[PDB]
Design a protein around this ligand. Structure first.
Ligand SMILES: O=C(CS)Nc1cc(-c2ccc(Cl)cc2)n[nH]1
Ligand SMILES: [Zn+2]
Length: 388
């Protein structure tokens, strides 16, 4: 048994207990393609969020193969159906685990609300989607429909340990850094994890939560350029939080706010100028992004950015949604700075409720493993951790 619904009748964030073998239906189980590949079977676990239980050979054309040229490879991983089902379930469980915490509910709500802006038009009076913020969803009868989405969780490329939150860019627009945002893809595996020193293992809910925090930043187009580094990038230090984030430059973070506060006013000015759209009323999409960015509307219908709601939204995404705060809500052991990852990679299986639960992770209550983080101790609980 998986223990995917420890309390209540049904999972609270993921919409169905999928089986990889479940039939396609064009709604939440479907063959999809990323705007050329071969159709891939995907699961829609929530509004705006799809799971592709496949190795990623799609996003980067330069990464279409799974052999080698801090790392680990294995072309066997995630090639059979039992594996795709185990991964679909592992990702499911972890969403439920994250949503079982106040902070995770806040974060996943923010993500679903962060629809990528409709800035894909070359006519300033016109709202239009950007079609790289979409997937094509094949129906049972063979037809496509283009569906917008915020977040895709997909398997890793050749380098199974490399986890990242990446997205498709625009010729001219820096979508992750102008406020618009864009559809985020997280290369992630629930099937392996990292060691840190007593020799323990990182709880995979923390790691998924890390990448989601990047997804939040990137969905509201307030990411820190990856060229700003110490190499550790500012974006990584922010996402980790705790005392690592203090080292970000002083007032240049206060620059960052002003920059993106202005970027949000450029978006508000764009919504006001909108006079046409290319179904869904111009009214309806303007509201969508009113809700997203917390825009104010006057009796006249003009949009603007309230400084205080901006601050609260940009404080929420950049300082509250951190890896360190998740460590705290999860009450797990984590490395204390972004660098203290030692090079231990472990195979794990979190899907068996006997191995790890939505509420306790590995540190199973009322057992050996509940005290002193034993469940995360790769030697005490070596049952759950196979070193590579
Ligand atoms: O941390 C990031 C940016 S989200 N990327 C990353 C680090 C790793 C990694 C690889 C190996 C080990 Cl031991 C620890 C972490 N994979 N992907
Ligand atoms: Zn990161």
């Amino acid at each position: 048994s998986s223990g995917l619904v420890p309390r209540g009748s049904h999972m609270q964030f993921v919409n169905k207990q999928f089986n990889y073998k479940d039939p396609v239906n064009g709604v939440d189980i479907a063959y999809i393609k990323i705007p050329q590949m071969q159709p891939v079977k995907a699961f829609k676990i929530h509004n705006k969020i799809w799971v592709i239980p496949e190795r990623d050979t799609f996003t980067n054309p330069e990464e279409g193969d799974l052999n080698p040229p801090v790392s680990y490879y294995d072309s066997t991983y995630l090639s059979t159906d039992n594996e795709k089902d185990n991964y679909l379930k592992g990702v499911t469980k972890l969403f439920e685990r994250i949503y079982s915490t106040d902070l995770g509910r806040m974060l996943l709500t923010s993500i679903v609300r962060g629809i990528p802006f409709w800035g894909g038009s070359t006519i300033d009076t016109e709202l239009k989607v950007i079609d790289t913020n979409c997937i094509n969803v094949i129906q049972p009868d063979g037809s496509y429909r283009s569906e917008e989405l915020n977040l895709v969780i997909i398997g890793p490329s050749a380098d199974i340990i490399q986890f990242e939150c990446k997205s498709f860019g625009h010729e001219v627009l820096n979508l992750t850094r102008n406020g618009y945002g864009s559809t985020q893809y997280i290369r992630f595996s629930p099937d392996f994890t990292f060691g840190f020193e007593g020799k323990f293992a990182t709880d995979p809910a923390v790691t998924l939560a890390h990448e989601l925090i990047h997804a939040g930043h990137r969905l509201y187009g307030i990411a820190i350029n990856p060229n700003r580094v110490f190499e550790v990038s500012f974006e990584e230090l922010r996402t980790f939080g705790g005392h690592d984030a203090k080292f970000i430059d002083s007032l240049q973070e206060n620059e960052f706010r002003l920059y993106y506060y202005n970027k949000f006013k450029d978006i508000a000015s764009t919504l006001n100028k909108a006079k046409s759209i290319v179904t869904a009323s111009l009214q309806y999409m303007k509201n969508v992004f009113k809700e997203k960015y917390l825009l104010s509307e006057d009796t006249s219908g003009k949009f603007s950015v309230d400084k205080l709601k901006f601050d609260k939204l940009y404080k929420m995404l950049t300082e509250i949604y951190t890896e360190d705060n998740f460590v705290k809500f999860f009450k797990v052991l984590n490395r204390k700075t972004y660098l203290n990852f030692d090079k231990a990679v472990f195979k794990i299986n979190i899907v068996p409720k006997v191995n790890y639960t939505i509420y306790d992770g590995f540190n199973l209550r009322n057992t050996n493993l509940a005290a002193n983080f034993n469940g995360q101790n790769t030697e005490i609980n070596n049952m759950n951790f196979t070193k590579l």
